[PDB]
Amino acid sequence: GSHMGDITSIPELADYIKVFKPKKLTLKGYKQYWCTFKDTSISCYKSKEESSGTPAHQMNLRGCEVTPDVNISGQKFNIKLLIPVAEGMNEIWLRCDNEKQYAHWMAACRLASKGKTMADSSYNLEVQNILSFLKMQH
Numbered sequence: 001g002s003h004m005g006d007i008t009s010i011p012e013l014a015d016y017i018k019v020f021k022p023k024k025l026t027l028k029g030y031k032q033y034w035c036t037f038k039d040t041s042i043s044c045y046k047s048k049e050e051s052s053g054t055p056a057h058q059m060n061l062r063g064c065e066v067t068p069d070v071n072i073s074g075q076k077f078n079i080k081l082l083i084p085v086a087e088g089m090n091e092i093w094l095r096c097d098n099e100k101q102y103a104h105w106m107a108a109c110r111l112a113s114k115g116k117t118m119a120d121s122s123y124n125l126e127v128q129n130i131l132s133f134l135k136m137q138h
């Protein structure tokens with residue numbers, strides 16, 4: 001809602017990365033979408049136009065399971081996004097794009113696990129940790 005508390009989305013976190021799923025039926029996978037962490041639920045827009053700008057997916061997924069495995073040797077970042085649900089498990093994995101990428105979602109994703117987003121000072125240590133390897137060697 002929007003009356004006494006929960007005025008707006010206190011925790012703002014958003015970025016654009018690639019996503020690709022095996023799809024249960026067929027679909028097409030491979031899509032550029034910019035999701036954002038609102039008050040306590042997520043939102044998804046593939047085109048601010050959508051004729052009305054209304055997002056296609058909007059719900060509180062949370063429980064995102066993150067697996068950190070990024071070898072800087074070839075500057076290869078590989079984070080798999082898994083989420084348990086009633087149907088079973090939504091296997092999802094986003095593609096890499098630049099160190100600035102892992103810092104935004106890899107951290108938020110982790111936080112998003114405890115339910116909150118990068119609104120915790122702890123996340124600082126998560127992003128401050130990755131960029132630390134760059135200082136050591138590109």
Ligand SMILES: O=P(O)(O)O[C@H]1[C@H](O)[C@@H](OP(=O)(O)O)[C@@H](OP(=O)(O)O)[C@@H](OP(=O)(O)O)[C@H]1O
Binds near residue numbers: 019021031
């Ligand atoms: O537009 P089409 O070709 O139908 O495909 C989309 C994409 O698969 C979306 O992927 P992403 O999750 O990266 O946004 C999402 O898949 P999922 O269904 O697995 O969530 C949409 O869910 P639906 O719009 O609810 O069908 C699906 O419709």
